[PDB]
């Protein structure tokens, strides 16, 4: 599913609003990608589904801090 494996994050509904002003159901979506990383920690590369900011955060923060978070949050990779 379009789940940004870093920041949960997902598809979010709302409207197209025409000029004449008519609502319409739609989806907003993250630009999310399947980017790869290095990890001198685990001597693998891994590859995880990640958002726009999905990356932006893992840059400010530690590329390694996440795997840890996520290891608590109970998922494999």
């Amino acid at each position: 599913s379009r789940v940004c494996q870093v920041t949960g994050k997902r598809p979010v509904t709302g409207n197209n609003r025409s000029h004449a002003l008519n609502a319409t159901k739609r989806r907003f979506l993250p630009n999310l990608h399947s980017h790869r990383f290095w990890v001198e920690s685990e001597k693998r590369f891994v590859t995880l589904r990640v958002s726009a900011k999905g990356m932006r955060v893992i840059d400010k923060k530690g590329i390694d801090t996440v795997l840890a978070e996520l290891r608590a949050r109970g998922e494999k990779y």
């Binding site: 290095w38 990356m55 840059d59 530690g62 590329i63 390694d64």
Partner: protein
């Protein structure tokens, strides 16, 4: 981005200099190949511990040598003796080796290494200064007067 480096890198990578650089080379590959690190607010001062650890310590402990080149300079004349030929010409040689023990028993313990000289000494007797390699810069300035017997 701040990501701090390790090696040279084109242009810069002055071992340890924080940066303003695009997220590409970094994260994408560079960092992903032992070459820099997330310059987090943690790391950013991790190596500051190193800059401020390796410095004052092992650095100025070159002064824990400097003065042993001055211990040397306290006694500005030591004598070694080993047969001469009349008018100077001493048969064998003053040895890079001998000059070890010769000051091994005269205080400044030393081994055959240190001991920098000018020419494949020795042969002629009398007066001879000597610069040393106790570390990097401020050499010694030792002299050895060779008696005959």
């Amino acid at each position: 981005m701040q990501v701090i480096l390790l090696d040279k890198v084109a242009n810069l990578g002055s071992l340890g200099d924080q940066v303003n650089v695009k997220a590409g080379y970094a994260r994408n590959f560079l960092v992903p190949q032992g070459k820099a690190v997330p310059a987090t607010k943690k790391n950013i001062e991790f190596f500051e511990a190193r800059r401020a650890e390796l410095e004052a310590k092992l650095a100025e402990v070159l002064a824990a040598a400097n003065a042993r080149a001055e211990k040397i300079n306290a006694l500005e004349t030591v004598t070694i003796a080993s047969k001469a030929g009349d008018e100077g010409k001493l048969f064998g040689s003053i040895g890079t080796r001998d000059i070890a023990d010769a000051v091994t028993a005269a205080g400044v313990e030393v081994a055959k290494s240190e001991v920098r000289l000018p020419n494949g000494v020795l042969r002629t007797t009398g007066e001879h200064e000597v610069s040393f390699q106790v570390h990097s810069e401020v050499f010694a300035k030792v002299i050895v007067n060779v008696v005959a017997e």
